[PDB]
């Protein structure tokens, strides 16, 4: 789950897809 933000965070270069569980980016 969470194919990104597993160590830091991106949400800028498409770093996120869906499973992203990082509650640090304005993803959802
Ligand atoms: Cd993030
Ligand atoms: Cd995100
Ligand atoms: Cd992410």
| DSSP result, the chain | --SS-SSS--SSSS---SS---TTSS--
Tell whether 20 is in a known binding site: yes
Determine contact, residues 10/25, Cβ cutoff 8 Å: yes
| CA of 23, nearest ligand number | 1
CA atoms of 7 and 22, how far apart (whole Å): 9
As a dihedral over the C-alpha atoms of residue 17, residue 7, residue 22, residue 3, rounded to 10 degrees, the angle is 20
Cα 26 to ligand 3 centre (Å): 9
| Alpha carbon 20 to its chain's center | 4
The candidate with the shortest Cα–Cα distance to 28, out of 12, 15, 11, 7, is 11
CA atoms of 22 and 5, how far apart (whole Å): 6
| CA of 27, nearest ligand number | 2
């Amino acid at each position: 789950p969470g194919p990104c933000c597993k160590d830091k965070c991106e949400c800028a270069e498409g770093g996120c897809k869906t499973g992203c569980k990082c509650t640090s980016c304005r993803c959802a």
